[PDB]
């Protein structure tokens, strides 16, 4: 009569898509979008799963991060899809081990224009745009 819980699970998409008219930027075979509507870090999974088809919350590897930051603005921050699973450090929906500054947080990760690594924030309820990806 009050609250309902929805255990949602998220994975990387198996299909191929790229909106050539509305993408934020593109690198290799992946088209990256910045959500125009700000969201929380947890909501970014659903927000990216529904911006465009075959799109999900992406975590930037050291080689993609400079491009993401170059497509960013001075005062703009961006939630990134790097999450913790205990040991084995931080990872993404694409797998791999990420270098994450985890001193002042352990849950949500974001990047700015001048961020050199993904940085974990102490509060995940902040409203920042999401970084979504779709392979071409």
């Amino acid at each position, epitope marked *: 009569l009050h609250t309902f819980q929805v255990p949602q699970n998220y994975t990387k998409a198996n299909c191929t898509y790229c909106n050539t008219r509305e993408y934020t930027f593109s690198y290799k075979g992946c088209c990256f979008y910045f959500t125009k509507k700000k969201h929380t870090w947890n909501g970014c999974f659903q927000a990216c799963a529904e911006l465009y088809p075959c799109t999900y919350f992406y975590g930037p590897t050291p080689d993609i991060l400079p491009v993401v930051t170059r497509n960013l603005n001075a005062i703009e921050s961006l939630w990134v899809g790097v999450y913790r699973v205990g040991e084995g450090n931080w990872t993404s929906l694409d797998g791999g081990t990420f270098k994450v500054y985890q001193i002042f947080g352990s849950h949500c990760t*974001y990047v700015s224009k001048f*961020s*050199t690594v993904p940085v974990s924030h102490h509060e995940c309820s902040f409203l920042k745009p999401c970084l979504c990806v779709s392979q071409r």
Partner: antibody
Amino acid sequence: EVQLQQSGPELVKPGASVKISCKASGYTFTDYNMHWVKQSHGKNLEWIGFIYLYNGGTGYNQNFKSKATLTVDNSSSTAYMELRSLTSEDSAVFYCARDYYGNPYAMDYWGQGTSVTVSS
Amino acid sequence: DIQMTQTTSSLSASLGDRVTISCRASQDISNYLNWYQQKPDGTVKLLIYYTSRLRSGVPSRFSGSGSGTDYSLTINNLEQEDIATYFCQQGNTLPFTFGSGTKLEIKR
């Protein structure tokens, strides 16, 4: 410009307390962390601690926990540091520092410094 | 327990020369090293962050390099405004720690 204005020089009796102030300016207060560092003698710097400007959460160096207390006034955009039980070894210059946005391992803006003298 | 050791406490060089200040960490700090400059009036401003990233506004005469435990800050074409003390600072773990500092004096 001046964006991090610190309090003036303070002279405190041994064993007493002191409240150093650090006023903010040109930036959104609740998006950063405020660090406090101690410079004793004429060079040696010592990181005292930090405070989350949003919720007021704090973190301290273990050599400063029973001396420093960090507080924040969100509406006035101020960060306060209370030092207690000051001995003649605490005569030093205390700095407040706003960290780099997106790089919290670095402090990109510093105060002018507040000199605290402890003597009878 | 990460300690920062500065190899030198005082450096002397002429105008237009090149000075290199070195810092050493007791353990790997994964490039989380910053270089700050404190001038005689006590004003401190961050020159370099993340080993080599030059903060916007600082002249390109300042540069950084290093890895693991060894890091270095280089000032090329020494100017009279560079008379100051230079500190290294690791941010890899808490508590943050600083180096002893290196005072740069102009030799004439």
